[PDB]
Amino acid sequence: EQSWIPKIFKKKTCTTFIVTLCQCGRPRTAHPAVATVWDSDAHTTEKPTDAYGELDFTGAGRKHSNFLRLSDRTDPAAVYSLVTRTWGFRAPNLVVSVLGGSGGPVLQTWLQDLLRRGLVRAAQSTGAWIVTGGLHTGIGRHVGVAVRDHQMASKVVAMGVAPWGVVRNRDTLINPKGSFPARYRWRGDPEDGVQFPLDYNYSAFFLVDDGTHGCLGGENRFRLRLESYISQQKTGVGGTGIDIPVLLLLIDGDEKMLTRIENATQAQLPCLLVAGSGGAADCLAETLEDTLAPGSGGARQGEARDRIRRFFPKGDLEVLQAQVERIMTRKELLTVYSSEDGSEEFETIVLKALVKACGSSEASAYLDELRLAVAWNRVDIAQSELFRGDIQWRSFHLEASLMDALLNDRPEFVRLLISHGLSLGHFLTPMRLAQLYSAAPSNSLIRNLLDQAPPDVGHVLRMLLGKMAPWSDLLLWALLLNRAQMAMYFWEMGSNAVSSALGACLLLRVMARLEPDAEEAARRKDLAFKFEGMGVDLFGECYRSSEVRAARLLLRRCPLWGDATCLQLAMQADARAFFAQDGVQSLLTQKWWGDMASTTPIWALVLAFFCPPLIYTRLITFRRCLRRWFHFWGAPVTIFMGNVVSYLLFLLLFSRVLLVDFQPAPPGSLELLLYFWAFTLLCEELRQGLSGSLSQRLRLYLADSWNQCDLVALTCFLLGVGCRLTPGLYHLGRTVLCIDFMVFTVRLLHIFTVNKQLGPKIVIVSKMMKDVFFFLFFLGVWLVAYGVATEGLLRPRDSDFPSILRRVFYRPYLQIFGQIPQEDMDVALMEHSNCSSEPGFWAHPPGAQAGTCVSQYANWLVVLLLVIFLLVANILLVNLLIAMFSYTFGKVQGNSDLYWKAQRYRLIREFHSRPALAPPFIVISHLRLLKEAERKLLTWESVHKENFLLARARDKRESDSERLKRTSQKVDLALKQLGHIREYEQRLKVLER
Numbered sequence: 006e007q008s009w010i011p012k013i014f015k016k017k018t019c020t021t022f023i024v025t026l027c028q029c030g031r032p033r034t035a036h037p038a039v040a041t042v043w044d045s046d047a048h049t050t051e052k053p054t055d056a057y058g059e060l061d062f063t064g065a066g067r068k069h070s071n072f073l074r075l076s077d078r079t080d081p082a083a084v085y086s087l088v089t090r091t092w093g094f095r096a097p098n099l100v101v102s103v104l105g106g107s108g109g110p111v112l113q114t115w116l117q118d119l120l121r122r123g124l125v126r127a128a129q130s131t132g133a134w135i136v137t138g139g140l141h142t143g144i145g146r147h148v149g150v151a152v153r154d155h156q157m158a159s160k161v162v163a164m165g166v167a168p169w170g171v172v173r174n175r176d177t178l179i180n181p182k183g184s185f186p187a188r189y190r191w192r193g194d195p196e197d198g199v200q201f202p203l204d205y206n207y208s209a210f211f212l213v214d215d216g217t218h219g220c221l222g223g224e225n226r227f228r229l230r231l232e233s234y235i236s237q238q239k240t241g242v243g244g245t246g247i248d249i250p251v252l253l254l255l256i257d258g259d260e261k262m263l264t265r266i267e268n269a270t271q272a273q274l275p276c277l278l279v280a281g282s283g284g285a286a287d288c289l290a291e292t293l294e295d296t297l298a299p300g301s302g303g304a305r306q307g308e309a310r311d312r313i314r315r316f317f318p319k320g321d322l323e324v325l326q327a328q329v330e331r332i333m334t335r336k337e338l339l340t341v342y343s344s345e346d347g348s349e350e351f352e353t354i355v356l357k358a359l360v361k362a363c364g365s366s367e368a369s370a371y372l373d374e375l376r377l378a379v380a381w382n383r384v385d386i387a388q389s390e391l392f393r394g395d396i397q398w399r400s401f402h403l404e405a406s407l408m409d410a411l412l413n414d415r416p417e418f419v420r421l422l423i424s425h426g427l428s429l430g431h432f433l434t435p436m437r438l439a440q441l442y443s444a445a446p447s448n449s450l451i452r453n454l455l456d457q458a459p460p461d462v463g464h465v466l467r468m469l470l471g472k473m474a475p476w477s478d479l480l481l482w483a484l485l486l487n488r489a490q491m492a493m494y495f496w497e498m499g500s501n502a503v504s505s506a507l508g509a510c511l512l513l514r515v516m517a518r519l520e521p522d523a524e525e526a527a528r529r530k531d532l533a534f535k536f537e538g539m540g541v542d543l544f545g546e547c548y549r550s551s552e553v554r555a556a557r558l559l560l561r562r563c564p565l566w567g568d569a570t571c572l573q574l575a576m577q578a579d580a581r582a583f584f585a586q587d588g589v590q591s592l593l594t595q596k597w598w599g600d601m602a603s604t605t606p607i608w609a610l611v612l613a614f615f616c617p618p619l620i621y622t623r624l625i626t627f628r629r630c631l632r633r634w635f636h637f638w639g640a641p642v643t644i645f646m647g648n649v650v651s652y653l654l655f656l657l658l659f660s661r662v663l664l665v666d667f668q669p670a671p672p673g674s675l676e677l678l679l680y681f682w683a684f685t686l687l688c689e690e691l692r693q694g695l696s697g698s699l700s701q702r703l704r705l706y707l708a709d710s711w712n713q714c715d716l717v718a719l720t721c722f723l724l725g726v727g728c729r730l731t732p733g734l735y736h737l738g739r740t741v742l743c744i745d746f747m748v749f750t751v752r753l754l755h756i757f758t759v760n761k762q763l764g765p766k767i768v769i770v771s772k773m774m775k776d777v778f779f780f781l782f783f784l785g786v787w788l789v790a791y792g793v794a795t796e797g798l799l800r801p802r803d804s805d806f807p808s809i810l811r812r813v814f815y816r817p818y819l820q821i822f823g824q825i826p827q828e829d830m831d832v833a834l835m836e837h838s839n840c841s842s843e844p845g846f847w848a849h850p851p852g853a854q855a856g857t858c859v860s861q862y863a864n865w866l867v868v869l870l871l872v873i874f875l876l877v878a879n880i881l882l883v884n885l886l887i888a889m890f891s892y893t894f895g896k897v898q899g900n901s902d903l904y905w906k907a908q909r910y911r912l913i914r915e916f917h918s919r920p921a922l923a924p925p926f927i928v929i930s931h932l933r934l935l936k937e938a939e940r941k942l943l944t945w946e947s948v949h950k951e952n953f954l955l956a957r958a959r960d961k962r963e964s965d966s967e968r969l970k971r972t973s974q975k976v977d978l979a980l981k982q983l984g985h986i987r988e989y990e991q992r993l994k995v996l997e998r
C-alpha cells in the first residue's frame with residue numbers, strides 16, 4: 006500500500022559541486038557533469054525517495070521499524086498524515102521532544118534515572134510520542150537505553166529524526182522499489198567518526214535528506230516544523246477532538262540548542278529546562294532564578310554566566326547574551342525543572358508549565374491539560390490550576406474528563422469533577438455504560454461473565470446471586486470492576502446506604518469466592534470487609550438516634566434490588582460483624598419473644614406454659630382474648646419451648662419402648678404410638694426442606710448440620726422398624742434402633758445453642774476436632790506399636806484372630822483408663838506350668854481372654870514396656886491434649902462468639918415459620934396446612950449518613966498528623982512571603998540613596 010510514498014516525498018542530492026573536497030560535503034569520484042558558499046536549496050536536486058521501508062533490525066527486535074527518507078523542504082502535514090494513517094500510529098495524546106548534546110560517552114546517573122523514570126513512565130501512561138535524535142549517539146542513545154530498560158520490565162512509541170548523511174549502513178536502506186522488510190547492520194563494528202548507526206529502540210525514523218554525506222543541524226528546520234504542526238493539530242475524530250500538547254525538554258547542549266529553543270519559543274511551543282544538565286541548560290535556569298534582575302549590577306552578570314555556565318569560546322561574544330534577552334522576552338512559555346535532589350517526578354512540573362503556557366481563559370484550550378492531569382494521578386494540581394475559578398466550565402466540557410477518570414480508575418478526580426455541579430442524571434447514557442463495562446481489564450473475570458451473558462447486567466446478577474437513580478448503577482459498576490475508591494465514593498452519594506452496603510458486601514464475597522485469580526479475591530475480600538464495617542458503623546449511629554424507626558423499618562422492610570429482606574442479605578453475605586451489633590441483637594431478641602416483652606423472666610414463661618390461664622394475668626407483659634392467646638402461643642420462643650418439651654417426651658417414650666415394650670411379638674400399643682410419633686417427625690422435617698428452585702431449596706436445607714442429623718436419625722429409624730417387622734431380623738432391628746436412639750439424643754444439643762452463655766461453647770467445641778484427630782492418630786500409632794510388641798513377647802497359645810485383636814488393641818486401650826491387668830502380663834504373678842513341647846518356660850495367666858499360657862522368656866521387657874506405655878499415653882499424650890485445648894479455646898473464643906451471634910438469626914427464622922403445634926400433634930397443623938413513609942425513612946437514613954461522614958472527616962482533619970501537615974505548609978507560605986519581604990527591603994535600601 007506504500008506505493009504512493011515516493012511520489013509525494015523526494016531524496017535530495019548535492020548535484021552541483023562547490024569547492025578534492027566539496028562544500029556540499031559529499032566528496033566522491035566526481036559530481037554529475039552539471040557540477041561561492043554552498044546553500045541547502047541553491048545547489049541541490051530533488052529526486053524521488055529511494056530509502057522508504059520498514060527496518061527489521063538484525064537479531065533481537067520486534068521485526069517492525071519504519072524507515073523513511075525525506076527532504077528538509079517538506080510540509081510537516083504530509084509526514085504527520087502518513088504517520089497517523091499508514092504506519093498506524095495513534096494520535097499522540099502528548100508529544101515531548103528531548104533536545105541537547107549531553108557531551109560525553111555517558112551522562113550523570115541521576116539524570117539518566119530522571120529520564121527513564123520521569124519521561125518514559127509519563128509518556129507510557131499517556132501514550133506520548135517522544136521525538137529525539139534518531140541515532141545511537143549522545144542524548145538519543147540515552148533515551149533509547151531508557152526506553153529499552155522500561156520495555157524490559159513491562160509500548161511507548163518513540164519516533165526519531167536523523168539527517169540521512171550521518172546514518173551508517175545506508176546501503177541496506179537504499180531501495181527504490183521499496184523494502185517492506187529490511188536488514189540493518191546495527192551492530193556496526195567500525196565506529197568511524199561522524200557516521201552513526203540507528204538505535205533500534207525507536208519505532209520510526211525520519212531520515213532527513215539535505216544532499217550531504219553527514220552533518221548536524223540539518224534536521225532542526227524539519228523537526229521544528231513538525232513540532233509546530235503537531236502543536237496545531239487535533240487528536241482523532243478529525244477536528245472534534247482537542248489539541249495535542251507539545252513540550253520541549255532540553256538537557257545541556259551548546260549554542261545550537263540555544264538557537265533551537267529560541268526558534269521553538271518563537272513558535273509558541275512550551276519548553277522545560279532541567280536543572281543541573283550542564284552547559285547551554287544551566288545558564289537559562291540561572292537567568293530564571295534571577296528572573297527580573299536589576300540591570301545595574303546584573304547587566305555584566307550575563308557575560309559572566311556565559312563565561313562560566315557556557316564555554317569560553319564565543320562566551321564573551323554578545324550574540325549569546327542577545328539570544329538570552331530574546332529568550333527571556335518570552336519567559337512565560339519556558340520554565341525550569343529543578344532536580345530538587347533527585348525529585349524523580351515531573352508530571353506536576355510538566356502540567357504546571359503547560360497551564361502557564363496556555364495563558365487562556367476559555368476552558369476550550371485547557372481540555373488537553375485536564376486530560377493529562379486525569380491520565381496522570383496529579384489531581385491537587387488540577388484543582389489548584391484548572392479549577393482555581395478563573396475559568397468557567399460546562400457539563401459537556403467535563404464529560405470527557407469524567408469518562409477518562411472512570412475508565413482509568415481515577416477516584417480523586419471523579420470526586421473533584423462531580424463536586425463542580427455536574428448534572429450526573431442528565432449525563433449517564435446507555436452507550437456510556439456499555440463503554441464502561443467494555444473497559445474491563447483484558448480477559449478479566451467480569452469479561453467472562455459478560456462473555457457468557459448491551460450490558461445485560463441483570464442476567465449477570467441473577468446468575469451470581471442464584472436467580473432465586475444513577476448512583477446505584479455507578480456503584481454497581483464500580484463493584485464489578487473492583488474499583489474500591491470509585492465504589493466507596495458512589496456509596497457515599499447513594500440513597501439506600503445500609504441496604505446498599507450489605508448488598509455490596511454480598512456481591513464482593515460471592516465474586517471473590519468465584520474469582521479464580523487467587524489474588525484479586527484478597528482485594529475483593531478486603532473491600533467487602535470495608536463495606537461491612539462501613540454499613541455496621543452507619544446502622545449503629547442510626548440505631549442510637551432512633552431505635553424503633555431504624556430497627557423496625559430500616560431492616561424489616563423489603564430491600565432494593567432483591568426480594569429477600571435486608572437481614573437475609575446479611576445472612577447470605579455471612580456478615581458476622583453486622584449481626585454482632587447490639588441493635589440487631591436487640592432486634593432479633595424482640596422478634597424471638599414475639600409480642601411478649603423481651604424482659605419476661607424465663608420461669609414466668611414456663612409457669613404460663615403449664616398454666617395456660619396464667620397468660621391473662623400481669624405475669625406476662627406485652628377479640629382481645631383470642632388475640633392475646635395467639636400472640637402468646639405464636640411467639641418463636643414458645644414454639645421452641647413447646648417443641649423441646651415434646652422432644653423430651655419423645656425420647657422418654659422411645660426408651661420406654663426400647664427397654665421394656667420391645668418384644669419379638671407384633672408391636673404393642675406404645676410401639677405403634679412411637680411409629681406414628683416418629684412418622685410425624687418425618688413429615689415435619691419434610692416440610693422444612695420443601696419450604697426452606699426445588700433443587701436450590703433442597704440443597705440449602707441439606708446444608709444445615711442439624712437437618713443432616715435429623716435425616717440420619719429418621720432413616721435409621723425406618724431401617725429399625727423395617728428390620729423389626731421382618732420375621733427373621735428381630736435382633737438386627739433392635740440393635741439398629743438402639744444406635745438410632747443414640748442419634749436422637751445427641752440431637753438434643755440443639756437446645757444449648759439458644760442460651761447466650763452456652764451457644765458460644767458449642768461452637769468452640771466444633772473447632773476442637775482438629776486437636777482430637779491429632780490425639781487419636783498419635784495414640785493410634787502408639788497403641789499399635791505397644792500392643793503388637795507386647796503380644797509378640799508373650800506368645801500366647803490362643804492366637805485366635807478375634808482374641809489377637811483384643812489383646813493388641815482393646816486391652817492396651819483400657820490401660821489408659823486405669824484398667825491394668827498385671828496378672829495377665831507379669832509372670833511373677835502367674836503360675837508356672839507346662840503347656841507345649843515348644844522349648845522354654847511358660848506361665849498360665851488366670852484371665853479368661855489373656856491366653857491359655859504365655860511365654861516368660863524376657864518378661865522384664867514386657868513390664869518395662871508397660872511402664873513406658875503408661876508414661877507416654879497416660880501422661881504425656883493426655884496432658885498434651887489438655888494443652889492444645891487450652892490454646893485453641895483461648896484463640897477461637899472471640900470468633901466463635903461472633904459466629905453464634907450471626908447464627909442466632911438463622912435459628913429465629915427457623916422457628917418463626919414453624920407450625921404452632923408440637924410434633925406429636927403437629928399432624929393437624931400439617932393437615933390444616935394442606936409510600937411517603939419510605940421517602941421519609943430514606944431521607945432520615947441519608948441525613949445520618951452524612952452526619953456520620955462529616956464527623957469522621959472532621960475527626961481526620963483534627964488529627965495530629967493533619968495539623969502537622971497543615972502547619973508545615975503554612976510555614977512554607979510564611980517563608981515565601983519572608984523572602985519577598987527581604988527583596989522589598991533590599992530595593993528600599995537601594996532607593997534610600
Ligand SMILES: Nc1ncnc2c1ncn2[C@@H]1O[C@H](COP(=O)(O)OP(=O)(O)OP(=O)(O)O)[C@@H](O)[C@H]1O
Nearest residue numbers: 140141149150153190191192193202203204205206
Ligand atoms: N543501535 C545500537 N548500537 C549499538 N549498541 C546498541 C544499539 N542499541 C542498543 N545497543 C546496546 O548498547 C550496548 C552496546 O555496547 P556493547 O554491545 O559493546 O556492550 P554489551 O552489552 O556488553 O555487549 P557486547 O559488547 O558483547 O555486544 C549493548 O547493550 C547493545 O545491546
Ligand SMILES: [Ca+2]
Nearest residue numbers: 248363370371
Ligand atoms: Ca493548550
Ligand SMILES: [Ca+2]
Nearest residue numbers: 690693712715
Ligand atoms: Ca429440622
